Amino acid sequence: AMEANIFCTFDHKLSIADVGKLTKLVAAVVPIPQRLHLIKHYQLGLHQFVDHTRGYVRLRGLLRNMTLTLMRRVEGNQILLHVPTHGLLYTVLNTGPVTWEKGDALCVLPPLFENLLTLGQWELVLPWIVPMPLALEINQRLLIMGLFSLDRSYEEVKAAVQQLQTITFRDATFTIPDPVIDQHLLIDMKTACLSMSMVANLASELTMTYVRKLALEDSSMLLVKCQELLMRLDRERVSPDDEIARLSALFVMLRQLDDLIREQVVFTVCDVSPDNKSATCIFKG
Amino acid sequence: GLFSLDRSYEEVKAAVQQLQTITFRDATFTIPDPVIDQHLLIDMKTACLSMSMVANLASELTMTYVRKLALEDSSMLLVKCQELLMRLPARPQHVSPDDEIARLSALFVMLRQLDDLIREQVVFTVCDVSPDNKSATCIFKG
Amino acid sequence: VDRWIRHAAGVERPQLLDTETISMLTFGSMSERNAAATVHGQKAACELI
Amino acid sequence: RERSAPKPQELLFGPRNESGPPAEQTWYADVVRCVRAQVDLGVEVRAAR
Amino acid sequence: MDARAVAKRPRDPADEDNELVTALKAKREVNTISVRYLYHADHQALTARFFVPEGLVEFEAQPGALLIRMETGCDSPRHLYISLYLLGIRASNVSASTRCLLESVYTASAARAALQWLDLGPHLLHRRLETLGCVKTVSLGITSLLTCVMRGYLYNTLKTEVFALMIPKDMYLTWEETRGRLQYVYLIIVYDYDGPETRPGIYVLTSSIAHWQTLVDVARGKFARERCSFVNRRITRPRQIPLCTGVIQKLGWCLADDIHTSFLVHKELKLSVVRLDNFSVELGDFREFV
Amino acid sequence: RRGYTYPFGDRGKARDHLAVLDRTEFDTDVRHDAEIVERALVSAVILAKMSVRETLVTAIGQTEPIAFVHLKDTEVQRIEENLEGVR
Amino acid sequence: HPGFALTAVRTDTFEVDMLLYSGKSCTSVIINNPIVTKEERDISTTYHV
């Protein structure tokens, strides 16, 4: 009896070298846009989304929605993909740039940097599998690096940017690409930075009005401390429709950041080979 | 809940009238009995605390990004964005990537605290639909 | 004095992090590298009394 | 009170850490009340920070 | 596909003969190895094997110990595997007498190294810890081997005995008078921001609440003083950028009637514990709250 | 304190010069001031040159000359005039 | 000559072949049939005998 699997057919002629290349990846995580029984090879990987005017954060948002699946068997005329289920253990390949340890929690990221299966115009772009603290560090460093975009003229800013790019994890050192290209920032990262700054600016002025009203009632002596902190901050430096608009804008700009703000674990590892390229881990979704 | 504080009673009624109605995905819904009480009060307190901490933590770079961007960019998004703000060459007065990293790290925790009170736990994730919208197949979680 | 003595004896000055110090104190480390070539066996190191 | 900070060796090996003074002290006090003249001499009290 | 194929109920995993028996029957060849029954073939729990030095294995000889992975900040061991009991030393929640007892128990170089590494760095405690699960085996030696489950019940080879989860009594926490029938158990680390340095509190909470927001509201009610301390440090001590007042991690579920009080014996010393008889592990990640 | 936070490309030699700077103090021997000052000044100039990442001397048996970094020329000559007046 | 002498000690390791004698039925061994324990992973399963 078989297990349930998803069939993928390549709409391109394959040489023996190509299929020999595919069977090397017999445990890699392949993202798929929809849970569908039969698919064409164009749907594999991230190549379908690649764009010139968009960058990392939009790819992160799209990867949030895609379905993760593991390549299970390679044959002529077709590929077998297995979609994992919550609570079971599976074998995955360490295609990322960093070695793993037992007990690590892994999360999936768009690739930052050998090429695989260059067909006529399509490439098998697999994502990065990375331990969670490294992903948090990468997200924060990239967001800050985009925040310095307007100040790039000065040498001090350039030195800070170069320091931000170079990141070291266990036994591995690598540099992440600068989200500024041709002295300009892509629209998605621009929206992210603008949202962060807008949330900060709006909160700064909105907070005091409600804090001073609510702290008088406070039975937990904490809101008075918040008021005092705001007063110190201020000393270091309206129609109801406008107030409603500002509150709604604060909350809508808050929602824009949830892709950057939080991330979810997909695998937790408990086995590693000396061959460490592969590991066995349980799936969480 | 937040607007109800210190606002006049009649304009509170008007705001509740305009806010309670929602248009989503080409349909109109209205919230029944939007009472303000202790249950909303605790959420208001946590929101105020989180906003205070966000305002305290945010670096000067974060605050000044929007102001600096408007000097050389121009878009509908930006002009609609800057209408909400209070109306007021150079180099950054202080550059310190380590401080920026730590500050952003704490600010993420505070933003999560603020986000949680409007977030609702996902119970189902759907990938199918009956073309009459009456039924769908979903994955259960939570 | 430390610099002069270390130069005379032919020894490099140690540098270690506190975490590395703790690990070395507890578990030990193989801090001495192998020679370029060995025609004889292991170093039967002599300890002086 | 004035001994130097322990090195990693003594923390890892050998005896326990030398205990400091207890946090709660014993004091004696004289209490003088004015509204009806009354002075209580030599009362024992416990003081903590 | 046909009607009889659809009607056919699925094969019983227990009435089909396994692969090795299939091959031996196919060739009709005998083998010395007993093959008819495969052990652990029907264990639904997921387990892993961990190596740990002799000094660290104490109170984890008995099954049911919670196993944590700690970061050393070094490349030579990189990670160490420690129990909740060892964290009992550092926690302010534990009483003086119990602290003295289980400090006298862990008088080994490896345990002291773990404590020095824990206190050495500038990070908060929870950033240095990763939870693995509960242990149920021991093979003693200069290097000991522990097998730990990370999803499932605790039981031996034939399921002839189910193991409990042991929590030291000072770390046990309840917030309801009458227990709900189903109980979820959480791990809490809470930081007190006094003058010199942060003193962490460590708890294991048993609660009927599964919703995150309600649980965090109850926790914020119970830990008001630490939140006040967090804000006070934020005011008095700028350029110190603290994060979090506490973290909450979910690990497991058990029935209220399974909860009992008991003691543990090691080198004729008695430690008192709370005992979750039919505990099954289900790990989450650390979620932080303010 | 300001040199600690600068994003230097090579933190090692920067930390060495920071150490020699922060160790400096005067021992109230009226004759010892000049050499202490010279040591502090050469370390500080090395740090400033690295920050602007202008080239710096490396020949053995030789040390970085003491001079102002990127200072306005007129202010430089005014400072020289003041120092001559002191002399 | 400095005013002191020193005695050196070193240990050498030789590789040798051992010879063993034991009497008839000097000990009895008690065994059972080998047992198979199954450990399952997605790509491959391992059986412990």
In the block, residue with structure tokens 């600690």: F4
Q: Is the Cα torsion angle E65, E66, E71, E77 positive or negative in sign?
A: positive
A79 touches A71 (CB < 8 A): yes
Q: Which of E211, E241, E289 sits opposite B121 (nearest CB)?
A: E211
Tokens 């120092």 locate to F83
A 10 A CB-CB count for A69 gives 20
CA distance A176 to chain F (A): 16
What is d(CA B51, CA B60) in angstroms, rounded to the nearest whole number?
16
Query: In the complex, which subunits touch A with 3 or more CB pairs below 8 angstroms?
Result: B, E, F, G
How far is residue E196 CA from its own chain's centroid? 30
The residues pairing with C14 across neighbouring beta strands, listed in sequence order, are none
Q: Which of A103, A171, A221 sits opposite E132 (nearest CB)?
A: A103
Q: D5 CA to chain C: closest CA distance, Å? A: 15
CA distance E122 to chain D (A): 18
CA F71 to chain centre: 14
Say whether C19 and E110 touch across the interface (CB within 8 A): no
Q: Answer whether E134's CB lies under 8 Å from E279's CB.
A: yes
Compute the residue count for chain A.
285
Q: Does the beta carbon of B66 lie under 8 angstroms from any beta carbon of chain E? A: no
CA distance A104 to A268: 6
Write b or e for each residue in F20-50: b if 16 or more Cβ atoms lie within 10 A of its Cβ, otherwise e: ebeeeeeeeeeeeeeeeeeebebbbbbbbbb
Resolution (angstroms) equals 3.0
| Phi and psi, residue A18, nearest 5° | -65, -45
Q: Which residues make Cβ contacts (< 8 Å) with residue D8, sequence separation at least 6? A: C18, C21, C22, C25, E116
Are the C-beta atoms of A180 and A142 separated by less than 8 Å? no
Alpha carbon distances (Å) from E246 to A263, E169, E187, E240: 19, 20, 10, 17
Q: Helix, strand, or coil here: G48?
A: strand
Best of C24, C25, C26, C27 to substitute, by most chain D Cβ atoms within 10 angstroms, is C25
C23, E120: Cβ pair inside 8 Å? no
Cα dihedral E247, E251, E252, E257, rounded to 10, equals -40
**In whole angstroms, what is the distance from residue A151 CA to residue A193 CA?**
14
Instruction: Please spell the DSSP secondary structure of F20-59, one letter per residue.
Output: HHHH----S-TTSHHHHHHHHHHHHHHHHHHHHT------
**Distance from C-alpha of E152 to C-alpha of A282, rounded to nearest angstrom:** 12
Q: How many CB pairs under 8 A join C and G?
A: 18
User: Which one of E217, E234, E241 has the shortest CB-CB distance to B103?
Assistant: E241
Q: What DSSP designation does G45 have? A: E
Map tokens 């003295």 to a residue.
E100
Per the structure block, which two tokens stand in for A229? 């902190």
Answer whether G touches A (≥3 Cβ pairs < 8 Å): yes
Q: Does C26 touch chain D (CB under 8 A)?
A: yes
Distance from CA of C40 to the nearest CA of G (A): 12
Cβ atoms < 10 Å from Cβ of E239:
6
Q: Please indicate whether, in this complex, the C-beta atoms of F7 and B99 are within 8 angstroms of each other.
A: no
Report the candidate in E189, E181, E193, E221 with the shortest Cα–Cα distance to residue E205: E189
Backbone phi and psi for residue A260, each to the nearest 5 degrees, phi listed first: -80, -35
Supply the DSSP string of A228-258, one letter for each residue.
HHHHHHHHH---HHHHHHHHHHHHHHHHTTH
The amino acid occupying position E195 is G
CA E46 to chain centre: 14
- Which chains contact D through at least 3 pairs of Cβ atoms less than 8 Å apart? C, E
* Partner F, chain B 25-84, Cβ-Cβ below 8 Å: none
End-to-end CA distance of chain F: 32
Decide if A222 contacts E231 (C-beta within 8 A).
Answer: yes
Q: Is there a contact between E264 and E83 (Cβ–Cβ < 8 Å)? A: no
- The closest alpha carbon to A193, from A65, A57, A51, belongs to A57
Task: Judge whether B40 is closer than 8 Å to chain E, CB to CB.
Answer: no
Are G38 and E32 within 8 A, CB to CB? no
First to last CA, chain C: 25
Q: Tell me the residues of chain G between 16 and 45 that have a Cβ less than 8 Å away from chain A.
A: 41-44
Q: Of the candidates E210, E200, E198, which has an alpha carbon nearest to the alpha carbon of residue E94?
A: E200
The whole-angstrom distance between E261's CA and the closest CA on chain A is: 30
Q: CA-based angle E102:D14:E267, to the nearest 5?
A: 35
Tell me, yes or no, whether chains A and B touch by having 3 or more C-beta pairs under 8 A: yes
d(CA A245, CA C19): 53
What is the rounded CA–CA span in Å between residue D20 and residue C46? 45
The answer to whether the beta carbons of residues E32 and G33 sit under 8 Å apart is yes
Q: Distance, in angstroms, between D10 CA and closest chain E CA?
A: 10
Contact E265, E225 (CB under 8 A): no
SS3 content of chain C, % helix, strand, coil (to 5): 35, 5, 60
Q: Residue F65 gets which letter from DSSP?
A: P
DSSP string, chain E: --HHHHHSPPPPTTTS--HHHHHHHHHT---SS--SS-BTTT--SEEEEEEEEGGG-SS-SSTT-EEEEEE-SSSSS-EEEEEHHHHHHH-SSS-HHHHHHHHHHT-SHHHHHHHHHHHHSSS-GGGGEEEEEEE---B-SSEEEEEEEEEEE-B-TTSSSB--EEEEGGGEEE--SS--SEEEEEEEEEEE--SSS-EEEEEEEEES---HHHHHHHHHHHTHHHHHHHHHHHHHSTT-----SEEEEEEEEEEGGGEEEEEEEETTEEEEEEEETT-EEEE---EEE-
Judged by CB atoms closer than 8 Å, whether chains meet at D12 and C21 is answered as no
Strands B138-140 and E66-71: unpaired
d(CA E171, CA E205): 8
| Cross-chain Cβ contact C46/G10 below 8 Å | yes
Chains that touch B (3 or more CB pairs under 8 A): A, E, F
Subunits with 3+ C-beta pairs closer than 8 A to E: A, B, C, D, G
| CB of G49 less than 8 A from some CB of E | yes
- CB-CB neighbors (< 8 A) of C49 in chain G: 6-9
Q: Do G37 and E38 touch (CB under 8 A)?
A: yes
Concatenating the DSSP letter of every residue in A33-92 gives SS--SEEEGGGSSSTTT--SS--HHHHHHHHHHSEEEEEEEEETTEEEEE---TT-EEEE
- Amino acid identity, position E179: R
Experimental technique, in short, is cryo-EM
Q: A4: helix, coil or strand?
A: coil
DSSP labels, chain B: -TTTTTS-HHHHHHHHHHHSEEEETTEEEE-S----SHHHHHHHHHHHHHHHHHHHH--HHHHHHHHHHTTT---HHHHHHHTTSPP-----S---HHHHHHHHHHHHHHHHHHHHTT-----EEE----TTSS---EEE--
Residue A21 in contact with residue A71, Cβ under 8 Å?
Answer: no
Distance from CA of B106 to the nearest CA of E (A): 5
- Residue from E30, E40, E156, E157 to probe the interface with G (highest G Cβ count within 10 Å): E40
Which H/E stretch holds residue A16? helix A16-23
Which of F5, F6, F8, F70 is the best substitution to test chain B (most B C-beta atoms within 10 A)? F5
Residue F1: CB atoms within 10 A of its CB come to: 7
Backbone angles phi, psi at G27, to 5 degrees: -160, 150
What is the radius of gyration, based on Cα positions, of chain C? 15
Q: Which residue of D has its CA nearest to E109?
A: D12
For the record, the structure tokens of E129 come out as 């810890």
Query: What's the one-letter identity of residue A241?
Result: D
Radius of gyration of chain F (CA): 15
Amino acid code (one letter) for A243 = E
Burial class (CB in 10 A: 0-12, 13-18, 19+), B22: exposed
- Answer for the pair A256, A191: CB distance below 8 angstroms, yes or no: yes
Q: How far apart are CA A155 and CA A114, in angstroms?
A: 35
User: What is the C-alpha separation between G7 and G21, in angstroms, rounded?
Assistant: 40
Residues of G in contact with E35 (CB under 8 A): 36
User: Are C44 and G11 inside 8 Å of each other by CB?
Assistant: yes
Contacts of G among chains (3+ CB pairs under 8 A): A, C, E
Q: E78–A101: do the CB atoms touch at under 8 Å?
A: yes
Task: Report the residue of chain C nearest E53, measured CA to CA.
Answer: C27
Report whether E281 contacts E252 (CB < 8 A).
yes
Alpha carbon of A103: minimum distance to chain E alpha carbons (Å): 6
How far apart are the C-alpha atoms of A254 and A250, rounded to whole Å? 6
Q: Which residues of E touch B109 (CB under 8 A)?
A: 243-244, 288, 290
Gap between the Cα atoms of A195 and B54, Å rounded: 14
Burial string for B38-54 (b: 16+ CB within 10 Å, else e) reads eeeeeebbbbbbbbbbb
Chain C residues touching G7 at Cβ < 8 A: 48-49
- Cβ within 8 Å, pair E224-A268: no
Instruction: Provide the number of CB pairs (under 8 Å) joining chain C to chain E.
Output: 33
CA–CA separation, E115 vs E111, rounded Å?
Answer: 6
